[PDB]
From a paper:
Specifically, RON2s are transmembrane proteins secreted by apicomplexans into the host cell, integrated into the outer membrane, and presented on the host cell surface to serve as ligands for AMA proteins on the parasite surface. [name] [name] adopts a stacked three domain architecture, with Domain I (DI) membrane distal and Domain III (DIII) membrane proximal. The apical surface is comprised of several loops from DI framing an apical groove, and a single extended loop from [name] ([name] loop) that packs against the side of DI and is stabilized by three tryptophan anchors buried into pockets on the [name] apical surface.
Previous structural characterization of [name] in complex with a RON2 peptide (TgRON2D3) revealed that in order for RON2 to access the [name] apical groove, the groove-occluding [name] loop must be displaced. This engineered construct of [name] was produced in insect cells, purified, crystallized, and the apo crystal structure solved to 1.93 Å resolution. Superposition of [name]ΔDIIloop on RON2-bound [name] resulted in a root mean square deviation (rmsd) of 0.70 Å over 365 Cα, indicating strong structural conservation of the protein core. Importantly, a comparison of the apical loops that frame the length of the ligand binding groove showed a maximum deviation of 0.91 Å with an average rmsd of 0.35 Å over 13 to 21 Cαs for the six DI loops indicating that minimal displacement of these loops in [name]ΔDIIloop is necessary for ligand coordination. In addition, binding was detected between [name]ΔDIIloop and TgRON2L2D3, TgRON2L1D3 and PfRON2D3 in the micromolar range (6.0, 46, and 1.4 μM, respectively).
Author numbering: 69 to 340, 361 to 428, 431 to 435, 441 to 469
Write the structure that this text describes.
Amino acid sequence: GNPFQANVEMKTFMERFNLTHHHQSGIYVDLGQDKEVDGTLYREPAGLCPIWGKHIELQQPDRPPYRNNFLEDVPTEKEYKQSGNPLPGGFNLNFVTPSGQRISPFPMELLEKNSNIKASTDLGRCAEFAFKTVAMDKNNKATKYRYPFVYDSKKRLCHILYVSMQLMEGKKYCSVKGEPPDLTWYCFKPRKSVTENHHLIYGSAYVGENPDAFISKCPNQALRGYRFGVWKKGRCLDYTELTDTVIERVESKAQCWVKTFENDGVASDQPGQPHSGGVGRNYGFYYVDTTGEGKCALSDQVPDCLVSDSAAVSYTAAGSLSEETPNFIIPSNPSVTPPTTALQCPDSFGACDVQACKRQKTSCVGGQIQSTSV
Ligand SMILES: *[C@@H]1O[C@H](CO)[C@@H](O)[C@H](O)[C@H]1NC(C)=O
Ligand SMILES: [Cl-]
Ligand SMILES: [Cl-]
Ligand SMILES: [Co+2]
Ligand SMILES: [Co+2]
Ligand SMILES: [Co+2]
């Protein structure tokens, strides 16, 4: 009776929101796997979806030589000796080829021209590049450890991050703006900003295993005009009707989008199972309460239906603030189904929910599926 599971076109579309199914790992901190280097088992990011706007914010001293930018090269021994504690620089792999050719960041133009790179989108080409890049051990032998990446979609640069850590905190473990001075590491944590670094896309290398998969399987963009919901008692209940939903006031829809990533319940693999598998309070929407206040509803329930609401926007921890598809995830061949028709289009009513005294109404309006309770 659920229209969003009724026809396959609808089902397929709704699948992209199931981060347990496709992404399958932590989002805030992604450490879903473990791989051996130099006889040592290291935690490895593993998630299959790109995480839009995610960046790692550093807490280095606010002064030279420190840049507080995780895309800077990992420091050389000499740079570290020059700075003293904490480590300066960032997370970027600083290695060069036997030629002396820099490995990261790597320009998308060269990946586009590399016949061995099969992905059909620039974001996919970066992920594939990361998937085909493995850590070399102390004996310069290949391992199965793959570094995570950041795609800089503005500069069209693919960063391979030698530092795969995503969160460190506590004065026992790391320093904030140089205090305690005895510690090697500065503190850092993942972040999404209402205004900054929307052009940065974080991912595990395993986004690149089947590079074109994220296009259909991942909730890359915000969804305008609908509230996420769950099919219960023959109708679609948006999150505000569920008991375990967190509802909070926000000043803007972008604050809500940030909350779906930064709230304490988001899928995360950090100590800090320790393997979330993608389970978590990853889902939310902005809406306007009857009193006119902007609010944000957050849930760990994977949506399986939608409720129409022209003033709402549904977000996930994985996706972007924008509802608009950017050109760097539109495939350059016609075989791969593009990311964007699923919700276009008889007035259908459903059995009365006596418990709430409302009924489903599934219709078509403005060439677009309506779904509400009456
Ligand atoms: C989401 O995916 C998981 C894993 O495949 C599955 O167990 C669950 O039933 C799915 N839920 C929805 C709402 O599709
Ligand atoms: Cl001290
Ligand atoms: Cl001391
Ligand atoms: Co699936
Ligand atoms: Co593990
Ligand atoms: Co923006």
